[PDB]
Amino acid sequence: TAPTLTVTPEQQTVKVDEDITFTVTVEDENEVELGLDDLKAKYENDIIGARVKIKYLTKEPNKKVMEVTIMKATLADKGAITFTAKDKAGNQAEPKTVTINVLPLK
Amino acid sequence: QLTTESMPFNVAEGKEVLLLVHNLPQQLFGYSWYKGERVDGNRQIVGYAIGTQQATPGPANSGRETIYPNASLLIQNVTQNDTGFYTLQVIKSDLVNEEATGQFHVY
Ligand SMILES: [Cl-]
């Protein structure tokens, strides 16, 4: 079959200096690979510098739940992050993207 | 498993100390050194990215600290305020992290 990829919240709007959280869930009948290429590209130094926190709520071979927290939002955090998911047999899941919008504090 | 070694563990004021890392994980994404016993971005000394192969300073960098691709940390012209604990976080390709803390004493 095909892996199931769901991301919550699919879209969110925050203000400046606020934390942004979303959760990515992937599961299948076999070992799944969560595609982190886009997430890594957008927040490489932020992940390494503890500004973006990555928490695996589940790290089973066939089920992975990952929670991403972007702390102290800036207007540059307004953007989109794409995630992919395929099983060992190469059956790809339909990619889902997260939309984030940051608003000035006014 | 992941461990850090202070060489030397007792450093004279104004000398150098190299914090070696040993059991580095298999697939890696980056390293970050933090002053203290906790991983806090406000105390990040320096950061290394596997991809860019570049080293980025942090809020707690005094210019004397330099990280290397082997995850080791070099502090030159050490001061008294440099003494204490240091925390190393290794971010793997799974985006799962391994932490190891070291320390040295300045006399
Ligand atoms: Cl080794």
Author numbering:
A (entry chain B): 1 to 106
B (entry chain A): 1 to 107
Report text from the authors:
Here, we show that the bacterial R28 protein, which is epidemiologically associated with outbreaks of puerperal sepsis, specifically targets the human receptor CEACAM1. This interaction triggers events that would favor the development of puerperal sepsis, including adhesion to cervical cells, suppression of epithelial wound repair and subversion of innate immune responses. The human immunomodulatory receptor CEACAM1 (carcinoembryonic antigen-related cell adhesion molecule 1) binds to some bacterial proteins that contain an Ig-like fold designated IgI3. The IgI3 domain of R28 was sufficient for the interaction, and the N-terminal domain of CEACAM1 was necessary and sufficient for the interaction, as demonstrated in direct binding assays.
We solved the structure of R28-IgI3 bound to CEACAM1-N at a resolution of 3.05 Å. The asymmetric unit contains four copies of the (R28-IgI3)-(CEACAM1-N) complex (the four paired molecules are A-B). The R28 domain has an Ig-like fold belonging to the IgI3 subset, which we recently identified as a domain in the β protein from S. agalactiae that binds CEACAM1 and CEACAM517. Notably, R28-IgI3 has the following properties of the IgI3 fold: A’ and A” strands, lack of C′ and C′′ strands, and a truncated C strand. A notable difference between the structure of the R28-IgI3 domain and the β-IgI3 domain is the presence in R28-IgI3 of a helix-turn-helix (HTH) motif between the C and D strands. We next assessed the mechanism of interaction between R28-IgI3 and CEACAM1-N. In the complex, R28-IgI3 targets the dimerization interface of CEACAM1-N (the A′GFCC′C′′ face) using a pocket of residues (K45, Y61, K64) that have high electrostatic potential. Taken together, our structural and biochemical analysis indicates that R28-IgI3 docks over the CEACAM1 cis/trans dimerization site of the A′GFCC′C′′ face (residues F29, Q89, I91 and L95), and that the unique structural features of R28-IgI3 provide a site with high electrostatic charge (K45 and Y61) and high stability (I52 and I53) for CEACAM1 binding. Mutation of CEACAM1-N at residues F29, I91 or L95 abolished the interaction with R28-IgI3, while mutation of CEACAM1-N at Q89 reduced binding to R28-IgI3. Significant reductions in binding of CEACAM1-N were observed for Dynabeads coated with R28-IgI3 mutated at K45, I52, I53, and Y61. Thus, the analysis indicated that the F29 residue in human CEACAM1 is a critical determinant of human-specificity, likely through interaction with residues K45 and I52 on R28-IgI3.
